[PDB]
Subunit: 206 residues, 4 copies
Amino acid sequence: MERNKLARQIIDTCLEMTRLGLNQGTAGQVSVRYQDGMLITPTGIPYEKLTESHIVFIDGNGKHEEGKLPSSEWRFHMAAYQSRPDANAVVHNHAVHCTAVSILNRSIPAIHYMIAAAGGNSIPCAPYATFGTRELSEHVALALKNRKATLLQHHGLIACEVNLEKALWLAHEVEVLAQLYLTTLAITDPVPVLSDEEIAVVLEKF
Amino acid sequence: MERNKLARQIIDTCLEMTRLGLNQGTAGQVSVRYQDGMLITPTGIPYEKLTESHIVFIDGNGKHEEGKLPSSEWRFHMAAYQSRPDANAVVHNHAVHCTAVSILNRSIPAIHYMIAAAGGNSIPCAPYATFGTRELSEHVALALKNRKATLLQHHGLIACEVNLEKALWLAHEVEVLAQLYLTTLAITDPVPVLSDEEIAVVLEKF
Amino acid sequence: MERNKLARQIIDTCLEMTRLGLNQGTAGQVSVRYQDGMLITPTGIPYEKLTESHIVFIDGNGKHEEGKLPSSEWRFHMAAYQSRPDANAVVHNHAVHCTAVSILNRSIPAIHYMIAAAGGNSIPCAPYATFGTRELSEHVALALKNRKATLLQHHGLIACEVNLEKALWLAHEVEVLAQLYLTTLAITDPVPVLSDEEIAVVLEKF
Amino acid sequence: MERNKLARQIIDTCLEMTRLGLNQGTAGQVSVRYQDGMLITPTGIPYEKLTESHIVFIDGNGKHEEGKLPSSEWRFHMAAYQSRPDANAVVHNHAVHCTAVSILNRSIPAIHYMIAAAGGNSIPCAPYATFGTRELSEHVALALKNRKATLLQHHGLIACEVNLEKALWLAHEVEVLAQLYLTTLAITDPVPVLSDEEIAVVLEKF
Ligand SMILES: [Zn+2]
Ligand SMILES: [Zn+2]
Ligand SMILES: [Zn+2]
Ligand SMILES: [Zn+2]
């Protein structure tokens, strides 16, 4: 569990995220819980030019390593870690279907049983606030209180989980749920949903 | 027709299914008829980490090999084999277009002549039941009585055929038919269909 | 211009067609004008298992080589060659956007200036007839009289051109035009089009 | 900063553009500012057959190198360079989502905060004019006065920036914004937008 191994995993997750079609250009970031803060990708540097040494350490006070510039969206990664003690990895991206649902400012309701993967019967959509601000951080911390993923209005998605593999897995599943919702919403509104009783059974079963 | 060769084919089918874009994360499973039961993929293990030895044997009584955990959705694979004696391979996935049609709880009608590939003039949609239950198994067995593929409401698709190659081929074709249906339904409802007389001619010709 | 070189080009075109996402499963076929008839892909054989020796010669009388089974849809390839003397290669596929427009039974109108690539201000849609019949062949021959591509109602697309490279290029462009049409039709009907005067200028310029 | 290095970058950008799904067939072109004019890709030659020596130099008077045929759409690349002195690279393509919005003749409004990447609160759509004409060039020069990207009605997109990497990055981002707009427009019209005050904050922050 050396820093370099965690750095490597972050980079591999970046590449896999792009592979899955969830990350376009320099939009996403991946972070992991580390010591008293986190390791996160830097600002600027395109993912394919990333090396272990580019990964940035930000302590619990929000001070980042010397000579490195963390992602411009680092603050809500720290908000996620402080809001959800169980979270050890965070994935943020601007995946198209998730982002399209965030533009409509809708939660994703229980249209499929895999919605329970994020912890309840919905995927919330936190209100808009300028990127990189403390206001945006507060909305994300409230949205993640009882869910492991949330949409961000006019912006994108944040997903957290116990490790990088699971966080990416969750982020992908939410993009699929988002695409199912938009595809069905174009045909019928509202879209048929499973009852809260049914989701309670699925939650227990998971 | 050794176990190891069948195991290899299952794994290759998994990889090909992901390649075709039908399988996201750990959602799908592939099984084959074997001896008095079946060989199926295990629960948990991501497809790219799968080795021959991970494949699970489940006998006709539903008892699985020691120390292996079969897919959580194994029961409806067994239901398919008992309902359709001619089926030797089963593919299940949560492909997005198929799943979106299953959310609307619609059958796919005869919008294209390749609908006859699944045996009739439609692709049915079996009613919802919690994953992994005997109730869900009963709905699938009734739906596969006269069709080789069925949608599962709020869930996904199941396709069966005489070998793995054909089962995957069928599963892909049904996802295409599903995408054609949703794309046209967004424009016009109902969507123009071929008559039952015409599908009878195609069926004879196939 | 040996047979084997033409066979190789056919196979490469098959692979490229699948690469471009125009060909799913065993749906498409590619043919070239040769001697007094044509060389076409066989029925059954999946594209990745195709070898030079699998390609089938069908003479001008419709008699095919001994021991080989031509595509089930060979007859409308012959109809294309007899209707358009200038055509030396034919591509048929069931590309999703083209096929979705064929289900609506609509021509694609002049929504983009590249529509002129197929010879006029539209992409026609020939009426449905059972696959492999002489009736279907007659509809295709009438549709290709003044266009190099046509949709086939409830079925797919046929594109022809002076060589394989250009035929595939045309088939791809028509699938893009089809996707533009369906994407815009979902928002507004009718879709804005360029005038016949404007298309006449583009045609001259090409 | 030799000619050959710039030629190589152009070719790599072509390949990357096709990789990202923004360039179909021979539709796009890439140019760079060079000496008193520009280097641009040639007409005809498919991107995968392009070599350093195929790249064409066009001086400030519009005279192109001997024995080479520049892209048929070179004139609006020159218009971009003369309208925006800061632009050193230009990307043009007929990306499907951008082109679909250009068919509707709509600007893309501030549905996402990344709209500020092109310089303001919108992506304009310049009026139609026949490809390759001076009229089309004038519309593009007016549209790029205060934006780094513009749609071209019934045609496609043009994006410019300080280097090839950034120009392609911008072109990709605009295609994502276009897909978000069409996906949301199919559900609701008008689509929710951020206020001009909010975009002013984002612009300052960038
Ligand atoms: Zn963001
Ligand atoms: Zn399932
Ligand atoms: Zn066909
Ligand atoms: Zn153009």
